Amino acid sequence: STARPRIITTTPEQRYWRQYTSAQLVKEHNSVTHISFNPQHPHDFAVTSSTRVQIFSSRTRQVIKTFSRFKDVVYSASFRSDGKLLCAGDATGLVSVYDSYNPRTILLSINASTHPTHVTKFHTQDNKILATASDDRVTRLWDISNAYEPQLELTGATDYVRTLSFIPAAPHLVATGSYDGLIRLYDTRSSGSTPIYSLNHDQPVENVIAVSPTQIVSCGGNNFKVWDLTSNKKLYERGNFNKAVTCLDYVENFDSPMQSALIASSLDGHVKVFDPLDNFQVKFGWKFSGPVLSCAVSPSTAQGNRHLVAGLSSGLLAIRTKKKMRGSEYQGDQEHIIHNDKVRSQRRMRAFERNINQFKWSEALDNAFVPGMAKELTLTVLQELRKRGKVRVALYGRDESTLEPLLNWCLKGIEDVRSASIVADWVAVVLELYGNTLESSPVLQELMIDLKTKVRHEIHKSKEAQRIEGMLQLLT
Amino acid sequence: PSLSQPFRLATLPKIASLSNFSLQADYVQVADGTFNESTNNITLGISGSSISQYIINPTPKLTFDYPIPSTNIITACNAEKGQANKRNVEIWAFGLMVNKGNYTLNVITKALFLSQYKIKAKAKVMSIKIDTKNSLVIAILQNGLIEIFDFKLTLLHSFDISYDNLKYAKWFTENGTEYVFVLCPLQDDKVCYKLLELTSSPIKELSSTIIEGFSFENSKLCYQFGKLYKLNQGKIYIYSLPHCQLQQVIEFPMVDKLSPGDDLISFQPVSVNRVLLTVNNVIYLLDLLHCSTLSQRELTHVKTFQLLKSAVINSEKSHNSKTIAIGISTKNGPNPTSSLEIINIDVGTNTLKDSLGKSFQVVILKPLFDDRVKCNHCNEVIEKLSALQDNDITSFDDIFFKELKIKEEHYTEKDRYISDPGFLNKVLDLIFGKFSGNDYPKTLTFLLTHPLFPLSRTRNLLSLLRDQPRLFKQAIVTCPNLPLNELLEELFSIRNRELLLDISFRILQDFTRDSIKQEMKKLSKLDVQNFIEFITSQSTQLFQLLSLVLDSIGLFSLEGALLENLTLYIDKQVEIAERNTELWNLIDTLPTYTMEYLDI
Amino acid sequence: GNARVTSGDNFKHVTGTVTVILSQALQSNDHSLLETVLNNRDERVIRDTIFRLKPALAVILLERLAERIARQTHRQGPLNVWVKWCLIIHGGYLVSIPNLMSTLSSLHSTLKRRSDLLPRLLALDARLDCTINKFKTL
Amino acid sequence: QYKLSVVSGGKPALNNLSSVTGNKNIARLSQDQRNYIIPFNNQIKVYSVETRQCVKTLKFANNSLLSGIFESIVKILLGDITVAHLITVFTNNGHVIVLNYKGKLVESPKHFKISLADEKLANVFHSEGNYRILTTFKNSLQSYRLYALTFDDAKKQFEVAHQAEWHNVILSNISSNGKLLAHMCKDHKSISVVSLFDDSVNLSFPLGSILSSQTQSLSYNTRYVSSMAIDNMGQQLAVGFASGVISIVSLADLQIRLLKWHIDSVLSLSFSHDGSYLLSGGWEKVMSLWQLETNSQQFLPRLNGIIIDCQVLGPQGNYYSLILQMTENNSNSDYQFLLLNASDLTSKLSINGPLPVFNSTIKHIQQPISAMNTKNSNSITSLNHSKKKQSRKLIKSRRQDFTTNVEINPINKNLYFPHISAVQIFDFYKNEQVNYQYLTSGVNNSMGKVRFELNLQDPIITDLKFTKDGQWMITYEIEYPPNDLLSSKDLTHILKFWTKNDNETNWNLKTKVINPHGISVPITKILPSPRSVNNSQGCLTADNNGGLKFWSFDSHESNWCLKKISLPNFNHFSNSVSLAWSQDGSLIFHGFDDKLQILDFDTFKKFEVSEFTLDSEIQTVKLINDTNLIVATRTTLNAINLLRGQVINSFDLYPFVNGVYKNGHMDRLITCDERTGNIALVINQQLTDVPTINYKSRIIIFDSDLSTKLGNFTHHEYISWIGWNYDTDFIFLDIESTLGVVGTSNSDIFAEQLHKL
RNA sequence: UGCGAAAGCAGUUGAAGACAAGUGCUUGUCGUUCGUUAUAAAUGGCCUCG
C-alpha cells in the first residue's frame, strides 16, 4: 500500500523584505532629520526631531527616553561604538554628549562654532575622538578628554559640510562631502587640514557612506555613485531616483538570502534596496506619503525582530518590522534499543479533496462553485475531474437551479486565458447533455445569451491580438 | 586559422657561411628566453656578424647589437631577464667556436656592460640555459659534459652523460621544475635517449633508453609539451616523454613527391598538436591530432623560407590564438639576398572545426553478412551506350535497362546497385551528347528520379527540361538538390498554374525561410509585381510563399495602388474562411392538462 | 515541491494627457503611479500620451505592458490598445533597435498564448450557436 | 575476442492455464517458513523471508539437465517424494527433478520421467504420502484426467493409475488443503465438487440453480463467472462474476448469499483455512478481506497492480501471497509476487523481474478479462477475437518493432526502464529491483480504474536519459486528454529535470517545462551535452520540424534555462530526427528527414559541406570516434570521414530493415562504444514452409569506420534493445525480459556432536 | 486497418454453425468455426495506527 498523493494547486531577496509587514505611522512635531540605531542589544534607535531626540524600544516600538535639553533644532543622534554615549548637534553650534538612557546628566558640552553644527559622529575605530562638522565649513575633530580645543580642524570646503564618514579599517582616513559637490578625504595621521584628494560629484552631497573598506557610496543630487579609493574613481552609478537622494544606510552579514543590503532615500517618497554583490541593482522598494529625509535599518546583530525606519519631512515616522505518568519524559537515554514508529498525520485536506478521494464527483463540482473560493483552486478541482474522466458523470444529476453556479463561473472564466480551454471543455458537455432542459428553462437561455456575447468579445481581442502579432513581425 | 604575410625584421649579411642556404638556418640562433607569446623582443645570433636584440612592435627596430668576428660561428645563444646581486639585469650567454681548434663560452650582463667574461669550453656548446633565480648558466657540450656555471663563469658542477657526439638537446619545464633531454647518435641507426632532472649533484638522471630505427641525417626534430616530433621521408614520427616511446606515425603525402636534395624543409611547433611545415616557399599549418591542413600560404616573392623558431601557444590554458614565427627568406634572382622575416600565425581554437574537411590524406557494394529467414559491369554498359549512333532513342534505352535489368519507369529500392555515382555521371553525359532538342530517352526520367543525381548536373537542368513539360514536372517532384535560384526564376517566369503550384511546395519543402527570403531580395520588382497580380486573379502554402514575398519586398518597396488590390483579395479570403470555419464546426456538430383524441 | 513552471516560448535567457506621470512612473518603477495612468479608458487620451512619450521610454513601456497582462489576463484587452498605439507611434524607433525578441519576449509569449484560444473558441461558438439557434426558433 | 553470456533473469513463472483459477501460484514457502522459493522462466530463486534477500539462485544454464529440459514448472513439492532442503520440480511435459537448495546444486539430480499418453501435466498435490496428478487431454474446452502417482522402489519409476476423467472443463480450482476440486462444465453450465483421495465428497448441480432470476434477466456479464473458491471442509463455495458480484453457496442445501463490493469482474477468491474469512481481489487494485461472521470487510488498497490470484499461506494464516498484474503495460503482462504479513498487512517480500515496455504486444500476451472491452482489458467476446487478431497480425503483418527504451546510470551503472508514467530502477548486477518511482502526474496510485475509467490513458514517458556526469535526469512525457471532449486532441508535451545525490535512492524534482517548442509539438529527440560544454550540465532538444533548443543549469538562477535556440519553422514533418554531438563540443550533427546538417555551436547555424544529402530518411546519426561519423538511413548505413568528407563503407540494410521497425528504433538498436567500436543488431523472423512466431537475432561488432567485423554472434530470441555500458561490455535486453551481455580426533567428534545437539 | 504529423490521406466492419425467446417463420446471442490489413446499468468506490 502507498500513501494517497496530495492534490496539486517574486525572488528570494524580495520575499525576505515583504516580511516587514507590520507598519505603524508616528507623527512628530518637526521633520525627523536623522535616524540612528544602537550597535548593542536591544538596538533601540534614535530619531532627531524638532528640539528633541527620542529613543524607541525595538520590541515595544514606542518612546523610552526623551532628550529635551536642546533649545534649538537638533541635528544628530549618532551613538558611540559601545552605545553608552549620545552626541548631538544644535543650530547654536553646541555639541552635547549624553549617557544613553540617562537624559538628565550632561557628560561633555562643547561649543564647536557659532554657526550650526549639523553633523556629529563618534569615530568607529577610536572611541575617544568625536568629529563635528559645522556651517563654518571646518570639520573639527574633538576628543572627550580635551573639550576646549580640537585635535584637528579639517578645512578646505567652500560650501556647507553636511556629510562626514569614517572608513572601516582606516582609522586615519576621514571622508567629508560638502555642498560644493566635492567629497574630500583627510588623513588624521598626517598634519591634516588639507584633503588627500577630492572627488567631484557635480551635485550637492547629502550623505556619504563607506559601504566597505575600499568602496564608498556617495548619494547626492538625483543619483548615488560608489567610489573605490584604490582606483579613486566611481565603480558604479545609479540614477533611478526622481527627487534628490538624501540619506543612505548599509547593513551586512544579516540572515537574509542577500548578504548585504543598501537602502537609499529619494526625497520622492521612495526608499529602495540595492544589492552590492550585483553592482548595486534595484531589488525592492517602498512608497510613502511624502519626501523621505532619513532611512535606517536594524544592525546585523539585531538579535530579535528586524526593523526598518524611514524619516519624512512631514515629521511622520514609518517603522516596518520583520518579527523573529512520571516516566512520560524518559526518552530512553539509558535504554538498550530505541525504536520509533510515530507518523505525523497528513496535512488538513480541503472539502473538494475529500469528495474526489471518496469519489463524490458531483459534490466536488459543487464544492468548486462556492462563495469566497480562489479562482486558481477552482481550476484545479475541475482540472482534476477532467483528468478523472468524470465530466458527464459529475453533470448527470443536475437541473437549472444547480447548473447556474457552474455557468456563472464560466461567464467569468472564459475571459481568463488559463480557464478558457477548461471553460471550453465543460460548456460543450452541459449543452450536449442539457439541450432539452435549456429549451424549457428561460433563465438558462438568458444566462446563455450573455455567454455568446462574451465569447464573441473574446473572438475580437484574439482577432486584434493576432493583428498585433503580425505587425510586430513586420517591425522586426 | 590563417597565416599572415611575412614582414621583414632585418637583412642577413653577405657572409660565405650564410651563402649556403641549405645550412643557413644552422648559422642563425634564436634565444629561447626572449622569444615567447608575451615578449616583444627577439635576441638573434647571426654567425660571423653579431648577436642582436630587436623590438618587433610597433615597428621592427634594432635595440642592441654585440659584434662578433667574421670567423666565429654562433653555436648556442640565449637571453633572458632577471635580477642579480639587487639590480634588474639582462644576462646574455653565447658559445662561439673558431676553426674547431677552440671553443669560447661568454657571458655578458647588461643593466636595464656591467660585466663581460669568457672561458674556453672543452667542446662545442650546443644548448645554453640560464637560471636567473639561482644566478646560474648551464651549458651542454657535444662531448657529453653538462657544466653549470655562475654568472662569473666559475665552474660549479659538471655532469657527464657518458656518451659523445650529441646532436639534440632541449630544455622544458613541468610543474615548476626544470628538465632537459638529450639525443646521442649510436651505430646501426641507434640512439640513446636520456632525461635529466635539474634540482650532492644538481643533475639527476631519470630515464635512459636506446631507440632503434631513429636516423638523424635526413630527420628534422622538434619537441613540444612532453612530445617529440621527427620528420623523415614524408612521415612525421610522434614520440612521447619521459620514455620517448613511439605513439603514432602520420604520413604526409605532399612531401613524398619531393625529390631528395633540392627541396628545403623546415619544421617547427606552434601550439598543442599543431606544427609549422615549410617546403621551399610554401608554408603549412598542420593539425597532427586530426591530420588536417589548417592553412597554406605560398610566398611567390621568395625562393625559400626556413623556420628558425616559433612562439608556441599552450592553447589548452591560453585564450590567445595568435602567435608569431621567425624564419629566413631567400629572394629569387641572380644575386639572392636572405632576410629575417616574422610571420603572424592564427593557430585557432584547437578544435575539430579547424580541421573539418581539410585532411591532407587522399565504391562497390558488399554484403552485410559473410554467411531460413524472411526478407522484406559499369564500364561495359558505359562503352555500349557510347558506341551507338546519334539520336537513337530506342537502342539507348534498350541497352540501359536490359543490361541493368531495370523494370519500372522511376527509381525503385531494387536499383541500389546502380546507385554508384560515376556510372550515372557519364550516362548523363552520354544522353546530353547523344540527344539534343525535343527528344530525350526515357533513361533521363530514371536518373531524374534517382536520389543520387549528380550535383554537377543539377544546374541548368530545369533549363534543359523547359521544352518538355513532363520532364520539367518530373524534376520538381523528385530531382534531388535542385538549386533554389533556378526554382525561383522558373517560379518567377512561368505562367502555368499547375507548374507554379508544384514549384512552391518543393521550394518550401527543401529550403528554409531565411534561405528563400534572401533569394527573394535579388528578384526584380516587376516580377514579384506580376505574381501578386496572379494571386489577386494547397493554396495555403502558396499564400505562405506570398507572405514570404511580401516581407522580402518590404514596406518601402510595396506600392499603395497594388496594396489596395491585395488588401481586397485578403479581405475576400478571410470572410470566406471564417464562413468555412462556422460550417466546419457545425459538421463536427408533462403538461397538467393535455388535449387528445382517441382512435377506435 | 518547489519546482518552477515554465514554457518553451520563454525567450528570456536566449490637455488631459498623463505623459509626464507615465514617464516618471516608468523611470522610477513606481507601480502605483503607473497603475493610475493605466486606469484611463479613453482611446483619445491613449494616443495623445503615447504620442508625446519619449521613444526611449517607449521600448521599456512595452515590457511592463507585457508583464501586467501576463499576471492578469483579464486586462489583456484594455492593455492591448496601449501596445497597439506604442508600436504605431514609435514603430520607426523600434526598427532601429538591435534586439527585439529578447527584450519583447514576454509580449510575444503573451500574444502567442492568447491566440491559441481563437481556434478552440470558434469550435464552441458553432456548437454554441447550434443550441442557441434551436431554442429561439422553438 | 568478444562473447555473449546471459546475466539477469526474467519474468516470474506462472501456471498459464486458462481453466485453472486460484492455482496460478507455483512459488512455495518452506516447511520451516524461513525462505520462499520462486521459479522463474529461466531460473529458481530462494529468498530468505526474514531478511528479504535472495539467499540462493539456481540457474537452468548451469545445470546440464536443467539446461536440456528447460517446458515450464507446473509445480514444486517440498522434500523428495522418492525419499532436509530437497525440492521436487514437476514440469508440464512430465519430467520430475529432485534438486537441493541451501547448498551447492548437484550436477546429477534424481531426474525422472512420468509416462503420459498425449496428456499435458497440469497440477499435482499430496496430503499424506499419497500423490494424485491432474492432466490435460483434448469445442475450445480442454478436458482433464485425474491419475494416481506412486514411486516403486523396485523399478525406481513413477507408475500412473487412472481414477477419474471430466470433460469440457471450463474452470477448475483446488482447496487450500489440496484435497477437494471444484470444476465447471458445459454438459448452460454445471459445477461439480469432488474429493480427490477419498470418495466422501461427490456433488454436482447446474449453474442455473445458483444464478438469480434477475441475473438471468440481465446481461451475460451477470451470468459470467470469473473465479471460484472451495472450502477445505467443503460446505461453502464462492463464485465470482464478471459484474463483480460474489455468491457464497452452501453445498448442503444450495442456498445462496450475495457479497457485492467489487464494481468490476472479481479475479481472485480464496477461502481461509477455517473458512470464516473470504479473501477477494479484482481490477480495483484493492484487497478485501470479507468477514463472513458479520459480513464486514477489511481493506488493503493501493496494491501496485490488479490482483490475479490470492492465497492464505500459513499454518495459522500468518502470510498472504498475492499476484499483481500492472495492466497499464499492454505490451507485456507484468507479474509481481507479493508476500504480506497478515499481522499488519505489510509487504514481507516483493519479487518481480525487469518490466520493459515494448512498442507492440509480443507472443500470445492477452489482456485480462474485464466487464467491458477497453484498451487495458478484454471483454468476454473480445478474448477470442483479440487472440486470433494478435496471431494473424504477428504472422501476416510486417511491422514488428517490439523495441523498448532503456537507460544506464553512469555513476551507478543501474538500469532504468521507462514504464508507463513511472521509472523502474533495476540492478542487473544483483538482478533485483531497487526502486519504482512515479515520474508523472495522473492516476498512477490514486485509485483503481474500473469500467469506463479504464479507458483513460495516463501520461506516457517516451524518452528517459541522463547527463554524462550522472547527477541529472531529463524526462520527456506526453499527457493524453480524455476522449469525448472538445480538448480531446491537444496532447500535452512536458519536460522535467530531476537530480539526486548518490546516497539517496529517490529523485526530487527541480524543473518542469510545459509545452516545449510550443503547443502540440512532440519532442522527437534529446541529447545530453558532454563533459566539455558546461561540464555535462546541458542538453539539446529536437522536434519533427527541425527546431533545436539547448537548456542548461544556471547556478545564479539555481535551475535550468534555455541558453540557446533555433526555430526553422519547417512546414513539413518527420518523426525521424537523429542527433549527434562532438566530444570536444563544437558542432552539432542534426539529421532531419533525408538531410544531415553540421551546425556550429557558437553561432548555432550551418557551418561556413554542412548539408549532406542521403538516399533516404535518417534513423541514426552517431560518431564512433571524432574522426568518423556513422549515419544509418532506412536503406543502408554509411561511414563518413569528416576529415575528408568521403564515404569509407556502405552496408545495405534494406533486406532486413524496410518497414519492420518504426523510425527512431534504429537509435536504440544501434549502439556504439566511445573507444573500441560499434555494434549493429538485426533481428529476423524464422519460418519453415509462412512466418512463424519465433524470432532470431544477429549481433555484429564492427570497428570504427566499419572496415572489419570483429565478431558475429547469435541469439535465439528477439533482442528488444542493446546499449553500451560504460565498461567495455554491452548489455542487451531480450523479449524474455532477459539481460545478456556481449563483451571481451576426539575433540573434533565432540565438536560435531555438540553442533548436532 | 494501412500510411503519416500531431493535421489528416485512403480502406473496412463478411460468411457458416449452435443456443434462447416470440409466433416451419421472425429477432437476439455465442468461454463455436472460416475469411478480410481490419453505451453502460445485480444500490455495487480504497483500512487502521492522535
UniProtKB/Swiss-Prot annotation, chain A:
Ranges: WD repeats: 27-68, 69-108, 114-152, 156-196, 200-237, 240-284
Cross-referenced Pfam families: UTP15_C, WD40
Keyword set includes GTP-binding: no
GO molecular function: U3 snoRNA binding
Keywords: Nucleus, Repeat, Ribonucleoprotein, Ribosome biogenesis, rRNA processing, Transcription, WD repeat
Keyword Ribonucleoprotein: yes
GO annotation terms (biological process): maturation of SSU-rRNA; maturation of SSU-rRNA from tricistronic rRNA transcript (SSU-rRNA, 5.8S rRNA, LSU-rRNA); positive regulation of transcription by RNA polymerase I; rRNA processing
Main location: nucleus
Location in the cell: Nucleus, Nucleolus
GO cellular component: 90S preribosome; nucleolus; nucleoplasm; rDNA heterochromatin; small-subunit processome; t-UTP complex
The protein's assembly and partners: Interacts with snoRNA U3. Interacts with MPP10. Component of the ribosomal small subunit (SSU) processome composed of at least 40 protein subunits and snoRNA U3. In the absence of snoRNA3, forms a complex with other t-UTPs. This complex can associate with pre-18S ribosomal RNAs.
Further details from the record: Present with 358 molecules/cell in log phase SD medium.
Function comment: Involved in nucleolar processing of pre-18S ribosomal RNA. Required for optimal pre-ribosomal RNA transcription by RNA polymerase I together with a subset of U3 proteins required for transcription (t-UTPs).
Protein name: U3 small nucleolar RNA-associated protein 15
Organism name: Saccharomyces cerevisiae (strain ATCC 204508 / S288c)
Swiss-Prot record, chain B:
Main subcellular localisation: nucleus
Cellular component GO terms held in the UniProt record: 90S preribosome; nucleolus; rDNA heterochromatin; small-subunit processome; t-UTP complex
Compartments in which it is found: Nucleus, Nucleolus
Alphabetical keyword list: Nucleus, Phosphoprotein, Ribonucleoprotein, Ribosome biogenesis, rRNA processing, Transcription
Pfam families tied to this protein: Utp8_b_propeller (PF10395), Utp8_C (PF22542)
Source organism superkingdom: Eukaryota
Annotated GO MF terms: tRNA binding; U3 snoRNA binding
InterPro entries given in the database record: Utp8_b-prop, Utp8_C
GO biological process terms held by the UniProt record: maturation of SSU-rRNA; maturation of SSU-rRNA from tricistronic rRNA transcript (SSU-rRNA, 5.8S rRNA, LSU-rRNA); positive regulation of transcription by RNA polymerase I; tRNA export from nucleus
Keyword Nucleus attached: yes
Function, as annotated: Involved in nucleolar processing of pre-18S ribosomal RNA. Also has a role in nuclear tRNA export. It acts between the steps of tRNA maturation/aminoacylation and its subsequent translocation out of the nucleus. Required for optimal pre-ribosomal RNA transcription by RNA polymerase I together with a subset of U3 proteins required for transcription (t-UTPs).
Additional remarks: Present with 16800 molecules/cell in log phase SD medium.
Quaternary assembly: Interacts with snoRNA U3. Interacts with MPP10 and UTP25. Component of the ribosomal small subunit (SSU) processome composed of at least 40 protein subunits and snoRNA U3. In the absence of snoRNA3, forms a complex with other t-UTPs. This complex can associate with pre-18S ribosomal RNAs.
Curated annotation (Swiss-Prot), chain C:
Domain of life: Eukaryota
Localization annotation: Nucleus, Nucleolus
Family to which the UniProt record says this protein belongs: Belongs to the UTP5 family.
Assembly: Interacts with snoRNA U3. Interacts with MPP10. Component of the ribosomal small subunit (SSU) processome composed of at least 40 protein subunits and snoRNA U3. In the absence of snoRNA3, forms a complex with other t-UTPs. This complex can associate with pre-18S ribosomal RNAs.
Functional description taken from the UniProt entry: Involved in nucleolar processing of pre-18S ribosomal RNA. Required for optimal pre-ribosomal RNA transcription by RNA polymerase I together with a subset of U3 proteins required for transcription (t-UTPs).
Note: Present with 33100 molecules/cell in log phase SD medium.
Protein name per Swiss-Prot or TrEMBL: U3 small nucleolar RNA-associated protein 5
Organism of provenance: Saccharomyces cerevisiae (strain ATCC 204508 / S288c) (Baker's yeast)
Swiss-Prot record, chain D:
Stretches forming WD repeats: 261-300, 456-508, 518-561, 571-608
Keywords of this entry: Nucleus, Repeat, Ribonucleoprotein, Ribosome biogenesis, rRNA processing, Transcription, WD repeat
Pfam families in alphabetical order: WD40
GO molecular function, one term: RNA binding
GO terms under biological process: maturation of SSU-rRNA; maturation of SSU-rRNA from tricistronic rRNA transcript (SSU-rRNA, 5.8S rRNA, LSU-rRNA); positive regulation of rRNA processing; positive regulation of transcription by RNA polymerase I
Annotated compartments: Nucleus, Nucleolus
PROSITE patterns to which the protein is assigned, alphabetical: WD_REPEATS_2, WD_REPEATS_REGION
GO cellular component: 90S preribosome; nucleolus; nucleoplasm; peroxisome; rDNA heterochromatin; small-subunit processome; t-UTP complex
Superkingdom of the organism of origin: Eukaryota
PANTHER family tied to this protein: WD REPEAT-CONTAINING PROTEIN 75
Additional comment: Present with 6560 molecules/cell in log phase SD medium.
Role summary: Involved in nucleolar processing of pre-18S ribosomal RNA. Required for optimal pre-ribosomal RNA transcription by RNA polymerase I together with a subset of U3 proteins required for transcription (t-UTPs).
Subunit structure: Interacts with snoRNA U3. Interacts with MPP10. Component of the ribosomal small subunit (SSU) processome composed of at least 40 protein subunits and snoRNA U3. In the absence of snoRNA3, forms a complex with other t-UTPs. This complex can associate with pre-18S ribosomal RNAs.
Name of the protein in question: NET1-associated nuclear protein 1
Origin species: Saccharomyces cerevisiae (strain ATCC 204508 / S288c) (Baker's yeast)
